Design a protein around this ligand. Sequence first.
Ligand SMILES: Cc1coc(CN(C)C(=O)c2cccc(C(=O)N[C@@H](Cc3ccccc3)[C@H](O)CN(CC(C)C)S(=O)(=O)c3ccc(CO)cc3)c2)n1
Ligand SMILES: [Cl-]
Ligand SMILES: [Cl-]
Ligand SMILES: [Cl-]
Ligand code: NA
Ligand code: NA
Lengths: 99, 99
Amino acid sequence: PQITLWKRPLVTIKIGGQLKEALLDTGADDTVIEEMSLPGRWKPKMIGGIGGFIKVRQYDQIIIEIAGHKAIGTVLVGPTPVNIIGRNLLTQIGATLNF
Amino acid sequence: PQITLWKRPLVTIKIGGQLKEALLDTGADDTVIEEMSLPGRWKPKMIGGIGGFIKVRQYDQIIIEIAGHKAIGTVLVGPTPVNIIGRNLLTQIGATLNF
Ligand SMILES: Cc1coc(CN(C)C(=O)c2cccc(C(=O)N[C@@H](Cc3ccccc3)[C@H](O)CN(CC(C)C)S(=O)(=O)c3ccc(CO)cc3)c2)n1
Ligand SMILES: [Cl-]
Ligand SMILES: [Cl-]
Ligand SMILES: [Cl-]
Ligand code: NA
Ligand code: NA
């Protein structure tokens, strides 16, 4: 699809068996999801943005379905105010910015 | 152009006669630039990023070139990890996300 930027680029994702709404976010290196359980190993990480840093759990090799496209990669889980699909998964679905 | 996302989508902007680097950021409603001098009056705004809220200075109707495209619109000045071009100016330059 071509997604307009008149509105926030929110899509439906499926992760860990759960449906969520998330932003397609070219400004985020990595994907960050609000608190949820994921299977397997994780390690702690600090990620920062406007307002400072939050602590997250880094889970590697997690499958997401993003607007119907499957992608695998790292997912950071923690107290983000919005679910963010970052570049590590945007690349895998072939997303580009065009103007 | 068509910009893939394997790297950060950094571009050159020109504001106040000065070249700066900025990140094309579809996850931001607004454009936020590091401390600099801009003409005119400003208004207060709070923005809630990933780590909490910051105060910024809102300047409206500012001339800014983005990757060689001319825009005129609102620029928020305050402490951000990187200059970010949000949807208010991505729409002015005709940007969309595509997959
Ligand atoms: C989606 C939505 C909810 O309410 C809002 C309003 N709002 C605060 C904005 O539109 C707004 C305005 C100006 C800047 C930002 C803003 O900072 N947006 C971020 C995504 C994001 C969206 C909403 C809340 C929190 C974080 C941004 O797109 C991604 N961010 C990095 C950027 C600042 C270099 S980040 O969220 O801090 C971030 C994401 C991922 C990592 C791990 O690589 C590290 C940091 C967002 N939008
Ligand atoms: Cl990854
Ligand atoms: Cl590609
Ligand atoms: Cl504007
Ligand atoms: Na894993
Ligand atoms: Na003004």
